Write a structure and sequence with these properties.
2 copies of one chain form a homodimer.
Chain A: H1 13-24, E1 29-30, E2 37-38, H2 41-51
Antiparallel strand pairs in A: 1-2
Bound molecules: zinc ion (4 copies).
Chain A binds a DNA duplex (20 and 20 nucleotides) through α1 and α2.
Chain lengths: 52, 52
DNA sequence: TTTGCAGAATCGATTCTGCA
DNA sequence: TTTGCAGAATCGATTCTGCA
């Protein structure tokens, strides 16, 4: 439950898994319209709303 | 007192002059450290504080 | 009728939390 | 003990406002 990079602590493994993407670079949420990509749903949800 | 581009209205000519930079591209406030540049003082003040 | 500073509000975009 | 959604809080960076 600890980001081995930034040292912050996170309520679950699930989320840690996710939180790591932002160090690792993994961005699995792909935009159906442009090549913008996202490590977390909320961000794609935002991008979709604001640009599409 | 009206931005001829976005149509917003601005309390003075002074500021309009400034506000236009962000359409025109003029960025006259130069960073003494990197090539980052700014149309408004506050922004350079921020950049300076946070990155230098 | 104009110049200015120093901070507020806002914006785009992200990560974290409440609740389920 | 784990998955998830939908929104909060935060972040970096900018433009606008209060006050002088
Ligand atoms: Zn981390
Ligand atoms: Zn897109
Ligand atoms: Zn304008
Ligand atoms: Zn700089």
């Amino acid at each position: 439950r600890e980001c081995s990079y930034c040292g912050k602590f996170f309520r679950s493994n699930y989320y840690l898994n996710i939180h790591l993407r932002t160090h690792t670079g993994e961005k699995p949420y792909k935009c159906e319209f442009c090549e913008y990509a996202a490590a977390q749903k909320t961000s794609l949800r935002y991008h979709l709303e604001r640009h599409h």
